[PDB]
């Protein structure tokens, strides 16, 4: 009974957050009404990590839904799994954040944040032994990015010894034409470097390219993008949710994955890559899972892992398979590409196997990499940031909310420092 409290903020945050709860509710045999109807005891053994129990043996997600406008949450409450959420855990404003980090962090979000913290507190108080928090949000908008990071900082102040974990969706001009997203994202990364323990870098650039190139979807939708995100979120939380040895709680994961406190940005990967309703009939072999899960084309961050080195890796295999073959194949990846794993962290790849496959697959594998190649992502954002900032373009939207240019300069400098620190360990020898 090591509870996690889940928060989802802004449009993107609530969209992928709601999909996460649909996907893992089905895995745990919980229906849209909160009733359990599964066939395995494995489903319920750690159900309390993400669910509260009610009377009638109802299971309620330990989830808080936040937004500065009502639209997406109205959508969620009218979705399939809308009823499953605790009605008092819907916390929303009317003003919106207008894709503006300053509105989310300093003005509009500040008016709403105490209400949110009140709900967070009610959930935390109910916990036998709270582990920490997970937040879903995008970095490119205003609410998830600005108010999301505001929340992270306030939660850290009230719960300074708990783990803070985020699923953070990075903007890409391949998916959004909103010009200020690199500003919002850079301001947010500055916050994440300081205040989270673990951040999964979910890159819309990678998501779009997987859909277009690999899944051959000529007009990718957010539904298609979020299908990849919810598969990934299911895979990377598997060790938290089912009986197991490795990375079985947020703190043990962090101690295995984070060798230096600022370098806590992870590149997730998944195999097999599927589109919604592709419904494929051949299971992958263990060698296939292993090859594909490490492939650049299967990464959810648009970074070439061959351009960097792995500091640490977690791999999670799901389904009925030979654990002997899993061990053999995992050893083969490392022994065949040993130069890509830093030699000064011995045995830095850990493997978990869970018997329960995700819905629709017999076999799957999820990859979590702490790779120095993630610098490519931050460099991409930094270049977009500087192209505008050198001319102070669009800054009036932010200074109108009380921000000074100095705050932008500090955020930029901190992210460029982060990039340089990755490069440092990339070039480091034993």
């Amino acid at each position: 009974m090591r509870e996690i409290v889940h928060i989802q903020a802004g449009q993107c945050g609530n969209q992928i957050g709601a999909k996460f709860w649909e996907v893992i509710s089905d895995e745990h045999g919980i229906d849209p009404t909160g009733s359990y109807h599964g066939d395995s005891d494995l489903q319920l053994e750690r159900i309390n990590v993400y669910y509260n129990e009610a009377t009638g043996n109802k299971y309620v997600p330990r989830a808080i839904l936040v937004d500065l406008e009502p639209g997406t949450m109205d959508s969620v409450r009218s979705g399939p799994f809308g009823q499953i959420f605790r009605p008092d855990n819907f916390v929303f404003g009317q003003s919106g954040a207008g894709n503006n980090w300053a509105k989310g962090h300093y003005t509009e979000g500040a008016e709403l944040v105490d209400s949110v913290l009140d709900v967070v507190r009610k959930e935390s108080e109910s916990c036998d032994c709270l582990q920490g928090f997970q937040l879903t949000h995008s970095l490119g908008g205003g609410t998830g990015s600005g108010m999301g990071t505001l929340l992270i900082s306030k939660i850290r102040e009230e719960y300074p010894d708990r783990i803070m974990n985020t699923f953070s969706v990075m903007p890409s001009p391949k998916v959004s034409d909103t010009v200020v997203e690199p500003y919002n994202a850079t301001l947010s990364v500055h916050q994440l470097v300081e205040n989270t323990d673990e951040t999964y870098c979910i890159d819309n650039e990678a998501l779009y390219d997987i859909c277009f190139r690999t899944l051959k979807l000529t007009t990718p939708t957010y539904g298609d993008l979020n299908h990849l995100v919810s598969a990934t979120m299911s895979g990377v939380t598997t060790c938290l949710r089912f009986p197991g040895q490795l990375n079985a709680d947020l703190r043990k994961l962090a101690v295995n994955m984070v060798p230096f406190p600022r370098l806590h940005f992870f590149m997730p990967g998944f195999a097999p890559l599927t589109s919604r309703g592709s419904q494929q009939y051949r299971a992958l072999t263990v060698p296939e899972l292993t090859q594909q899960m490490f492939d650049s084309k299967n990464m959810m961050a648009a970074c070439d892992p061959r351009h960097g080195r792995y500091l640490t890796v977690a791999a999670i295999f799901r389904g009925r398979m030979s654990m002997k073959e899993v061990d053999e194949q995992m050893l083969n990846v490392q022994n065949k590409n040993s130069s890509y794993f830093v030699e000064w962290i011995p045995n830095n790849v850990k493997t978990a196997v869970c018997d329960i496959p995700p819905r629709g697959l017999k076999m799957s594998a999820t990859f979590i990499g702490n790779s120095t190649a993630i610098q490519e992502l931050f460099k991409r954002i930094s270049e977009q940031f500087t192209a505008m900032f050198r001319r102070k373009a669009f800054l009036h939207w932010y200074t109108g909310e009380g921000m000074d240019e100095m705050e932008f300069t500090e955020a930029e400098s901190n992210m460029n420092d982060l990039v340089s620190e990755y490069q440092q360990y990339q070039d480091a020898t034993a």
């Binding site: 900082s153 850290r156 102040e157 300074p160 010894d161």
Partner: protein
Amino acid sequence: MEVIELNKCTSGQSFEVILKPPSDPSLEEIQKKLEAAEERRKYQEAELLKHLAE
């Protein structure tokens, strides 16, 4: 090969065979260490909360 000190009982026996001859810290100190570490944690937390207050 010399056998010595053969001891027997209903449960078993034992013997020795020679092939060749030859040729602190107080309770107080512990408590202090645990408290010094606790104070360092508390100091580091205090610095964090100060930073968050700024």
